[PDB]
Amino acid sequence: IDARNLFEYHCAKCHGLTGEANKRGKALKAPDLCDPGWQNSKTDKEILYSITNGKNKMPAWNERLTPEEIEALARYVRKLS
Ligand code: HEC
């Protein structure tokens, strides 16, 4: 699975290509995925859950993405630090 490319289409809209949240993401109170501080405040089961189910006001991706695709993405979110 090409998790980078799934990410940049689906996700980079808010988190930015590098995972520093851009002005769209900042305005929605997005975190900086790229931040080691943030990365260390979450687990993988937490990340997988939030992509699958949505997080506070944010929608779930388990319609548009397969479980496989969500896992690759979770592993990709980790590669941004
Ligand atoms: C804006 C329109 C977003 C898009 C598109 C995606 N995400 Fe997101 N994400 C966004 C916000 C505003 C937040 C914070 C929500 C809050 O109230 O805390 C998040 C959060 C995440 C997280 C962290 C989840 C957690 O429980 O802390 C992750 C791992 C994450 N987002 C990843 C992610 C992926 C993989 C996306 C594409 C499939 C994606 N997000 C889309 C804003 C937006």
Ligand SMILES: [Cl-]
């Ligand atoms: Cl999309």
